[PDB]
Design a protein around this nucleic acid. Structure first.
Lengths: 218, 340, 77
RNA sequence: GAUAAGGAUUGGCUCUAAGGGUCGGGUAGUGAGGGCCUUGGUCACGGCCUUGGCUUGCUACAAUUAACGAUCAACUUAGA
RNA sequence: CUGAAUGUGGAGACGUCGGCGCGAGCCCUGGGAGGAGUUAUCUUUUCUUCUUAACAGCUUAUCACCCCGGAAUUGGUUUA
């Protein structure tokens, strides 16, 4: 995981030339040309991370900030784990092991839960100091939380259907499908991104090029 | 082929089945020759280039290294304005890259131009508007001679061919061509512009860069080898060859170590010049030369050990050492017994 | 006689009903590198042949020794 | 073992498949990107939105014998 | 990786001589590790041991044969 700054003046600068120019020990002409061909789109500013949070053993799928602390960094990876991070010291504090790989993570700090959608077609609820939502038929790729309701969260999955869930329940209360005549259910129909926008509703996007908007207001 | 009769019985090596030989026969061009001392030959070339009237002159050289070396030296002479004419000088030998050869040939074919070429351009190819052909030396084989001077005379055009002879066995080349039904009318050309300086100029231009010295000596040795592989052995004799004259022609100041030089015949410049102070003028190779100089004794000892091991591996070497022992003992005994 | 390379085949041979004893033979010998080593031959005879397993590794030979049945008489050398 | 020799100053013919890989060429004008500047409003030395002055792109003349140079990687005495 | 009557084929099973190639035993011989003899003088000296059976597993072939191809500028080739 990379810990980065919005203000680029606060990071050490990296010089692509310096690797092959300052030592210049045994770099071949082919290597030099290959390195030079990576800077044809002008000389754009380049920066190094503030820190590297490295404890996972498999690729990391999502990382989020704590909705209150802004120092706690819950993340999910493919090594079956949810890891919380101390951003000040840049280390893992606590680790929870799940039975299947995790693909999406969302936080409900107003009722203190973590919803992690896994590759096992279900969303696990964890207490970051229990219940699982089922009904999806493929990888759960993205999650989001309703801004006005405290118990409602949306989930998108690779089966082309978005689903809205109440935390207290265990079954979907509405199942949004992609409204398109040219879309096929299993050929090109996936949801890679879903968003709960407090002013327009539910935004869905994926394998179909269309960006879909659904009301999702009471 | 324009000389298909020469390949007499070798045509059946091709595998002819039902063959029919065809012979087609018809002063278009002039065939001259000059008998001059070799050390003047290049100067004579210059005296032809800046005086004769031509649109294209093709000058033939024996070897490729000679083509490059003399091309560079003539360019240097033209820098000093030794020859003053609207002449553009090109070099084209067959060891170049193919693209360079094509570009040079298409530039020459396309305003008064001189070409320094080996036998690559002698046969087949036709450059229009070629007026003069010079053969700085007669070819290694005489069959190609008719091709080398054959680039001119198309449609009975007024073109001249000139050849140069070494003054020693020149009495044999003309009758040899006459028997082959070729008449060479002797031409007398004055050696203009040489009193004393030309060889001095060549020598002092060689002293500037050791690469020039290397190219000159390499070209001279290559010509000696080329002369070794000569048909009509009686006409072109290695013994009668003017080794000093040829070396003077190339601007050299020392005869390269050859079996020919040792047997059939040193410092041409009477005050000798040492190679230690001779600078290669090229930065990458200067340090290599200095390193080799600092490793003179080590390489000398490597060669000494190689020589000793060759001595021990020769035919019945132990017996040869025994015989040398006996001869040395008897001779050193007689060296005192006769005196006493 | 016969030579075998499979260790479990040797163990299966030593586990048969009609087995008398097994011989363990030690040889000190040189390898192609010149370093001496200890080679263990485990010999047991089946119905009509004598099967020999040659092991040039001390640890593998020790594990095979430990894996022999406790009711099998073992002849050292 | 080819290639004219094998104590010496080794460099050795013409044409004809390949001879380890890779990279590299000027002088001028204007567009781009970086760097040092600087000027206003804005939020408690640091941001946010704005103002004027080493890399590469496009055109115009020389060079096209780069037939040059640079770098990486390989290699040792066949004599009894 | 079934095979009756019936009909065939192979091994058993076959003259003598010549040179060439290959293997084994014997002979010759270098180093080293032991033992014995001679030694007025010389002699790294003289003698002797340094072995691997039937059987079993892996691997190993001249000849012969198969496939492509189509040859005089006649090639290949044996001690013959």
């Amino acid at each position: 995981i990379g810990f980065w700054s919005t203000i680029y003046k606060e990071m050490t600068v990296v010089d692509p030339l310096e690797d092959i120019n300052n030592p210049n020990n045994k770099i071949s002409t082919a290597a030099r040309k290959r390195r030079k061909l990576t800077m044809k789109d002008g000389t754009i500013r380049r920066r190094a991370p503030l820190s590297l949070l490295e404890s996972h053993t498999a690729p990391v799928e999502q990382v989020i900030f704590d909705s209150t602390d802004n120092t706690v960094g819950y993340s999910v990876s493919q090594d079956h784990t949810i890891k919380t991070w101390d951003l000040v010291t840049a280390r893992c504090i606590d680790t929870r092991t799940t039975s299947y790989s995790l693909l999406s993570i969302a936080q409900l700090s107003t009722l203190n839960l973590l919803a992690c959608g896994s590759s096992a077609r279900h969303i696990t609820l964890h207490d970051p100091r229990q219940q699982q939502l089922i009904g999806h038929k493929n990888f759960v790729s993205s999650l989001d939380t309703c801004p006005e309701n405290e118990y409602i969260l949306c989930s998108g999955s690779h089966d082309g259907t978005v689903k809205v869930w109440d935390v207290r329940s265990t079954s979907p209360m509405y199942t949004i499908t992609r409204e398109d005549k040219s879309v096929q259910k299993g050929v090109n129909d996936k949801v890679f991104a879903v968003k709960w926008a407090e002013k327009v509703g539910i935004i869905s996007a994926g394998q179909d090029k269309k960006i879909q908007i659904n009301k999702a207001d009471n | 082929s324009a000389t298909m009769r020469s390949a007499g019985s070798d045509i059946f090596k091709t595998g002819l089945r039902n063959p029919v030989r065809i012979t087609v026969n018809s002063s278009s061009l002039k065939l001259n020759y000059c008998v001059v001392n070799p050390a003047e030959k290049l100067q004579l070339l210059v005296s032809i280039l800046n005086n004769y009237k031509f649109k294209k002159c093709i000058v033939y050289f024996p070897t490729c290294v000679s083509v490059s070396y003399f091309y560079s030296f003539i360019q240097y002479l033209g820098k000093r304005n030794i020859l003053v004419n609207e002449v553009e000088i090109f070099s084209l030998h067959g060891k170049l890259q193919t693209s360079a050869r094509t570009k040079t040939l298409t530039a020459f074919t396309d305003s008064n131009s001189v070409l320094f070429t080996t036998d690559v351009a002698a046969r087949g190819i036709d450059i229009p508007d070629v007026d003069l052909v010079i053969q700085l030396d007669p070819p290694t084989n005489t069959d190609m001679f008719m091709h080398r001077c054959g680039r001119t005379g198309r449609a009975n055009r007024v073109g001249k061919a000139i050849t140069f002879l070494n003054e020693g066995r020149e009495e044999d080349f003309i009758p040899f061509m006459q028997v082959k039904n070729v008449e060479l009318e002797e031409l007398d050309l004055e050696v203009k512009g040489i009193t004393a300086n030309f060889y001095e100029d060549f020598r002092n231009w060689i002293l500037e860069d050791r690469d020039r010295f290397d190219k000159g000596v390499k070209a001279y040795v290559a010509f000696i080898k080329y002369y070794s592989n000569h048909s009509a052995t009686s006409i072109f004799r290695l013994q009668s060859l003017d080794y000093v004259g040829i070396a003077k022609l190339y601007g050299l100041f020392r005869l390269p170590r050859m079996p020919e030089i040792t047997k059939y015949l040193n410092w041409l410049v009477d005050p000798p010049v040492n190679m230690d102070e001779y600078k290669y003028k090229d930065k990458k190779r200067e340090k290599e030369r200095q390193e080799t100089l600092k490793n003179i004794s080590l390489i000398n000892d490597k060669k000494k050990l190689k020589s000793e091991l060759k001595k021990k591996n020769l035919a019945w070497s132990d017996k040869t050492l025994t015989k040398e022992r006996k001869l040395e003992r008897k001779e050193k005994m007689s060296l005192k017994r006769k005196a006493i | 006689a016969r030579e075998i390379t499979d260790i479990k085949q040797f163990l299966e041979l030593t586990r048969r009903a009609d087995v008398k004893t097994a011989t363990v033979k030690i040889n000190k010998k040189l390898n192609k590198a010149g370093k001496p080593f200890r080679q263990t031959k485990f010999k047991v005879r089946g119905s009509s042949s004598l099967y020999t397993l040659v092991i040039n590794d001390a640890g593998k030979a020790k594990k095979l020794i430990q894996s022999l049945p406790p009711t099998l008489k073992v002849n050292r050398l």
